[model samples]
Target: HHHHFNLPPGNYKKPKLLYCSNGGHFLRILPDGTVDGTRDRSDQHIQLQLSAESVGEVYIKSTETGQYLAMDTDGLLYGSQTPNEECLFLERLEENHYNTYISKKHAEKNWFVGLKKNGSIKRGPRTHYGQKAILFLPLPV
Candidate 1:
């Protein structure tokens, strides 16, 4: 099923979720700027705001912590209160109807936000042709 909403420019309504395709964990951005995966969808930390700025470009913000999802030079995911280049992501559509979030700064290299089996979030070269890099699934609102 699909859930549609009339969101404002660069803004999104919350109460939605992002899940890791491989580990079945929900993406969570902690108040202390930590990004990780959790199995509990009931946790407010996992609720996210997905704002589309342009075609294939989006910003993921935490509804609980008010921080943007960002990636560092070392390909690690974290939360940042400041909006900058590190917070920008490209929402790539894959064949299975799942979306992969690729860091804008490393788009040329196909670096995508991925989740590990241990529930940590990281940036890695796009290895999800049908694998675990297929992150960021939008749940029904």
Candidate 2:
């Protein structure tokens, strides 16, 4: 889904935000926010914006029951685990495949998956036009 915002050139949430160790990068926006500063950091924070164009679709599932919280990148998905529960930042590796950052601890052991867009729209994270891999585990309780 695509959205057109008539902003007066200000800081606005883009389709996706990549939070890295030293700093972060934001699409559709400049001066992206920073989370940590580890070149090989795995755990990350992501935020997505859902527009009117994106409604009904978009969802997140956790390994546990009643733990996963479906949020608009603007919202929060608390009680998530690292990599799985947490919003594992997705990097465009090649083609439809993505390289997910687990965390600095598991950074070396990164995982890759092919995305499969599910025609849905959420905020904090996104469900790209096509489906990609999704974190399907529970946060360490």
Candidate 3:
């Protein structure tokens, strides 16, 4: 099924702001590969460069830190300077008008980018349902 916001196959350099529904925090990628959330909407770290590899796949790169969102071997999410197999993410649209970013390399394991209660970002299982797993929301400019 085609969606209205289906991203065409191309590189989208547009800056995207992701707001975590869990804590109303904005996602941020640090230079040290640390993924976290902040309440500050003007934080440069919250800006993301979403590059589409396909309709459902893309590389989420940090505009401020120049890093790509990736999952480590231990299922930990981080920002990496180099693109690797772990850097690819599959966008899954949810019924609640939110999108879930599942790790392409770890889909079989049901890993996804999630937000913790303490405002920390981590890789969580797809089966896990809560504010953490449902934190994805694009903020309007």
Candidate 4:
């Protein structure tokens, strides 16, 4: 193969940190059902589970908030009980051998899963390939 894509767990266990490669932050799911970044990568670490629907397709779930990560058509990240197709993110391995998440529902528009330097959510329209904010390292919890 010219390139390889990585996948998360199949069944269930403790989540792997949705490690955001930028700003030394990890992807965090807030108690209020919002997505953000957390500097304290380990403590209160966000537990993310990937349930793949098919090759290169998956839904990101959170254990702490009991919500699924979804990017609505408006281009913002949210934790929803409904998830649906909006919750699916196509996981890709980009530069530095890390991974990036592209919205499956908004794939036509090329949106991404990202957070800011201030530990906040990065809007989908604002995301792009090679952007530091969008790069992430999936590590063990």
TM of each candidate vs. truth: 0.83, 0.20, 0.83, 0.86
lDDT of 1: 0.74
Instruction: Looking at model 2, report the run of 10 residues with the lowest lDDT sum.
Output: 21-30
lDDT of 2 by residue, 38-68 (tens): 2222323323332221222222222222222
Q: For every candidate structure, what is the RMSD over all alpha carbons to the true structure, in angstroms?
A: 5.8, 17.0, 4.0, 3.3
RMSD of 4: 3.3
Residues 26-50 of candidate 4 have per-residue lDDT tens digits of 8877768777888785656287887
CA RMSD (A), model 2: 17.0
Cα lDDT, all candidates: 0.74, 0.25, 0.74, 0.78
**Cα displacement (Å) at residue 127, model 3:** 6.7
lDDT of 3 by residue, 3-42 (tens): 2343323235467887778787877898888888888887
Q: Pick the candidate with the highest lDDT.
A: 4
The 10-residue segment of model 1 with minimum total lDDT is 1-10
- lDDT at 102 for candidate 3? 72
Ranking by TM-score: 4, 3, 1, 2
